[PDB]
UniProtKB/Swiss-Prot annotation, chains D, E, F:
Post-translation changes: Phosphorylation at serine and threonine residues in S-P or T-P motifs by proline-directed protein kinases (PDPK1, CDK1, CDK5, GSK3, MAPK) (only 2-3 sites per protein in interphase, seven-fold increase in mitosis, and in the form associated with paired helical filaments (PHF-tau)), and at serine residues in K-X-G-S motifs by MAP/microtubule affinity-regulating kinase (MARK1, MARK2, MARK3 or MARK4), causing detachment from microtubules, and their disassembly. Phosphorylation decreases with age. Polyubiquitinated. Requires functional TRAF6 and may provoke SQSTM1-dependent degradation by the proteasome. PHF-tau can be modified by three different forms of polyubiquitination. 'Lys-48'-linked polyubiquitination is the major form, 'Lys-6'-linked and 'Lys-11'-linked polyubiquitination also occur.
Name recorded for this polypeptide: Microtubule-associated protein tau
Function statement: Promotes microtubule assembly and stability, and might be involved in the establishment and maintenance of neuronal polarity. The C-terminus binds axonal microtubules while the N-terminus binds neural plasma membrane components, suggesting that tau functions as a linker protein between both. Axonal polarity is predetermined by TAU/MAPT localization (in the neuronal cell) in the domain of the cell body defined by the centrosome. The short isoforms allow plasticity of the cytoskeleton whereas the longer isoforms may preferentially play a role in its stabilization.
Swiss-Prot/TrEMBL site (Not glycated) positions: 7, 11, 15, 28, 34
Disease: In Alzheimer disease, the neuronal cytoskeleton in the brain is progressively disrupted and replaced by tangles of paired helical filaments (PHF) and straight filaments, mainly composed of hyperphosphorylated forms of TAU (PHF-TAU or AD P-TAU). O-GlcNAcylation is greatly reduced in Alzheimer disease brain cerebral cortex leading to an increase in TAU/MAPT phosphorylations. Frontotemporal dementia 1: A form of dementia characterized by pathologic finding of frontotemporal lobar degeneration, presenile dementia with behavioral changes, deterioration of cognitive capacities and loss of memory. In some cases, parkinsonian symptoms are prominent. Neuropathological changes include frontotemporal atrophy often associated with atrophy of the basal ganglia, substantia nigra, amygdala. In most cases, protein tau deposits are found in glial cells and/or neurons.
Notes on the domains: The tau/MAP repeat binds to tubulin. Type I isoforms contain 3 repeats while type II isoforms contain 4 repeats.
Tissues showing expression: Expressed in neurons. Isoform PNS-tau is expressed in the peripheral nervous system while the others are expressed in the central nervous system.
Chain positions found as N6,N6-dimethyllysine: 28
Organism listed in the record: Homo sapiens
Length: 34, 34, 34, 34, 34, 34
């Protein structure tokens, strides 16, 4: 007689960010020779 | 007779950030020769 | 007669951040020769 | 009822404003022969 | 009822503002012969 | 009822503001022959 089954499931594998952030704003330079 | 099953799941395998943040703002330089 | 089962599950494996943060703001330099 | 697997590797409300270098030189040397 | 596997490797509200270097030289030397 | 596997390797409200180096030289040598 009466029967029910509720089943939703979430799965992940090798996953997620490998982000590189690499700012090199090097500056403000004066070479001043007389 | 009456029967019910409720089945909620979350799974992970090897997962999450390998981030690399690497700012090199090197600067403010004077080379002043007379 | 009457039967029920409620079943909640979370699972993880080798998981979470391997983050590198590596700022090198080296500066403020004067080379001053007469 | 609901089931929501959701956002991975997402990036949100990010600013990048790397701003390297400036110079405000004022050059007023004085140099004479007789 | 609900089931929510959720955000991994996400990034939110981040600022990067690396700002390297500046120079404010004022160069008023004085040099004479006779 | 609810089940929520949640945030791993997430990043939220981060700042990076490495601001390396500055120079404020005021150069006023005085240099003479007669």
């Amino acid at each position: 007689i009466i029967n029910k089954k509720l089943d939703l499931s979430n799965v992940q594998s090798k996953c997620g960010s490998k982000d590189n952030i690499k700012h090199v704003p090097g500056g403000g330079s004066v070479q001043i020779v007389y």
